[PDB]
Amino acid sequence: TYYSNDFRAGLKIMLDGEPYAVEASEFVKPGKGQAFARVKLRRLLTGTRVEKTFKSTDSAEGADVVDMNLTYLYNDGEFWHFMNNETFEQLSADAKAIGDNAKWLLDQAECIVTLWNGQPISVTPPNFVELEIV
Amino acid sequence: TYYSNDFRAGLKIMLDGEPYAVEASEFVKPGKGQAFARVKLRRLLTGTRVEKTFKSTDSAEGADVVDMNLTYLYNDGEFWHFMNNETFEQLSADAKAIGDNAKWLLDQAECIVTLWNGQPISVTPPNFVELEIVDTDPGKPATLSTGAVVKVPLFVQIGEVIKVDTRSGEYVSRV
Amino acid sequence: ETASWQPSASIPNLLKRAAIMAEIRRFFADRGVLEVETPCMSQATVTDIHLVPFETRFVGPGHSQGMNLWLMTSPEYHMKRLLVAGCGPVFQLCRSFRNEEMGRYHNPEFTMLEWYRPHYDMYRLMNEVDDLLQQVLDCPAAESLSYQQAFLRYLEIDPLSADKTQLREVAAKLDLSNVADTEEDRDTLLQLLFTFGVEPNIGKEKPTFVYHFPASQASLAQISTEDHRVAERFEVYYKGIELANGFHELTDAREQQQRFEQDNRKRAARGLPQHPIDQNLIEALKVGMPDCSGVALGVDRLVMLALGAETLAEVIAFSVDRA
Amino acid sequence: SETASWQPSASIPNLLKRAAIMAEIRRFFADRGVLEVETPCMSQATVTDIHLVPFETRFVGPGHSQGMNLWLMTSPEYHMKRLLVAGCGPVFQLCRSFRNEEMGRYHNPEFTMLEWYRPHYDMYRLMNEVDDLLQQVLDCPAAESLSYQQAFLRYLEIDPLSADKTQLREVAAKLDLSNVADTEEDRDTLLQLLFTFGVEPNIGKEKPTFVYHFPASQASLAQISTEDHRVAERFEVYYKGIELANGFHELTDAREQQQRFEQDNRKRAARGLPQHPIDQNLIEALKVGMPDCSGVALGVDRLVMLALGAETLAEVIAFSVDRA
């Protein structure tokens, strides 16, 4: 758990059931009012930006969100497969997880995958790919 | 039991065995210097004024000094005798305590006796006393029943009683 | 750049800041408003619920006695004592302190500009402030909105009648449920909605005055005689920055003492320490203070907006971080 | 008898005249292009100056945050010197300063200070500027000025720079001060005892009196004279029995300055006084480079007091401690 006034950028926290990344935080305390934290967050499960308010005494649960640089295997039109050259483990990313990236996911290539609690939710393709001109 | 910068007019303190009464205390602390207490005191044994510096940390032990109204009764070459109107007890003051007021004491006079540890260290007679002239010639010097010599007008003769101001030792008027 | 020994404010910025200070003194000198200097330390403090002062202890010469003191959160109590003493209109540019307060726009110690105007109602005072913001910010005459119309405009809700349920869902639309659904204090709800629903959309082009705050948020202001629902309190905002808080001062000793007593009851009920009521201010109020209006403005914030700096630390020689 | 406590300690007329004096000082520097700066009242570090005891406070951050102790500034010097290094040029400040364990006719735990710094001014050129200010505000004549030495001869007929520790106590016994001198083993301590109770009460009677070139040992943060390394480039000005200002040709060597602080702490440890961590921000700034300059710290309250004919600090302060 982290305290409202520790919300530095890059912090992953659990909120109302979802994982978020802290983009920025600001201290707010209006005339005759209590102290707050105005936080700009990254709603991971949908890639959108949201803003939230917290009491300076509020806190949040750290969330499990790491970036594995797993290698892309192939997709069966529905799932995109990745593997760990060390762990030997594989993971499947659905269409919403890989999102608007399948365009550059060329068979056999290392990618940076953001997984929340093990399973992927974000796919970051190394945008230095050499592709075909069909 | 008292601190330098806590000294204050009236406080009775001890300094090298002698009793002193504080008149004024001033906090002093110069640039890059330590703190002091520059104070003015009255050397109670010599009715003298005096000034000295203490470190702000320095302390002084209290002193048992108190005034008290007593009535002078008599002198006998050894002690001047006064009496406590309340307690019914008496005190004896030597010639040091009587200081220079011996010549103003008349049986029955109310006097302010400054006591230190019980014993008297100074005596204050009434502001005005009424004494008879036991010798003088047709201002001019006159001798009082107390032995005191005062200047009076030329038209004042022996047998006449006058009032003198014991503070300035001057003739004030006739009685 | 950032080596800690270096000042957080740039020399160029410090040069202009000074110029604005002089501009401010002049402005008051031209209006015959006397300057005064009140203490930074005091045996008394304020009961205001959300403020938490600094404490320090005075020990006399030679380690004799001891005495706890509080750093002034504002010069207000002392200046009210002065108004009663008969000082006439006065202002002050002092350093104030507020613990637990640090951020982009807050520093534990900041410069406050506070002045009182005998015989000026909330409106005549506000006009004086506007004239000051116009000269320093070089902007147009501010706009004036009532707390009531500010809510209706930006949140289509009436803070004077709406109830916890109706306004708790406005909080959900602003996505503040996490801090609202669990709040049972109507005033705290309003503040939550105001600071996050109205403040950020206010004063975009020119500064904006908002008056008649709810009576519950009067602080030391008088309650309106017309509408007992609002107080003679106002604040002014610009570019999303809160610049000053002022009001038609409460002059009834009785009522003023009750509010302080309430502040202490609210603090204890929350686990916050209670602070002794400043008897001097009370006593002076009993003697009788002139009908007047006062206001406190955050100088650091004025300078910040005038030089277009992005943070308060940029217009302060040394913010706490490196003080 | 006394007026009710809610009331200010100084008369309103005095408060108005104080404001006029305040404006008069700002005008004076504004006319000479000296920049006004406001430095912090609270700081992570304090001074090591042996006889100063600073106020202390605790800063707690928003929400859950480790507390951080802070000291209230006894003077703005360390910040202004850092500002000097940052290239601010000639600057001055009218700030509120704080010093614990100081209460009296001429001291207030909190007081107002006028402190300014002149890049490339030597001790004498700064004193002259102090002279201009005093004449300006007090409307007195041009001050006189003597060295710490010739000031000691002229009143205690002793050469401070030479006179051994024994001759020192004789002059002490002369003015009845032996109660603090005899057991005293520090040469500068006796020298200070003599100076403030032997020279200060006799100077500045008719007009301000500057006293420069204090022993190299009482240099504080001032340079030691290049010529006579027995004295330090430091001066103090007095008037009507009141110490008004303390200034000096600033020590620019960071290496030297650091050691000096280390020596304060040791002298402190000895005296059983608490030690204080050396302000690294001042040292780091000194390492980068502080132009040669001179600074002075003037007690405004005492200046306003003299100007108004008041007899105590409390009569020129809105609210004295007992009413604060």
Ligand SMILES: NCCCC[C@H](N)C(=O)NS(=O)(=O)OC[C@H]1O[C@@H](n2cnc3c(N)ncnc32)[C@H](O)[C@@H]1O
């Ligand atoms: N009776 C006169 C008005 C009283 C106002 C009341 N005492 C008060 O404090 N209002 S305030 O809004 O809390 O503060 C006034 C201004 O001070 C500024 N301020 C407050 N806290 C800080 C901090 N911590 N840093 C910088 N500036 C600050 C800001 O502009 C505020 O609008």
Ligand SMILES: NCCCC[C@H](N)C(=O)NS(=O)(=O)OC[C@H]1O[C@@H](n2cnc3c(N)ncnc32)[C@H](O)[C@@H]1O
């Ligand atoms: N860097 C050059 C200036 C150094 C100044 C040095 N640090 C200093 O403090 N000198 S001082 O003599 O100790 O203080 C300067 C003046 O501040 C005033 N002063 C000091 N302490 C007090 C108090 N306690 N109350 C009121 N005025 C005070 C008085 O005029 C002193 O002469």
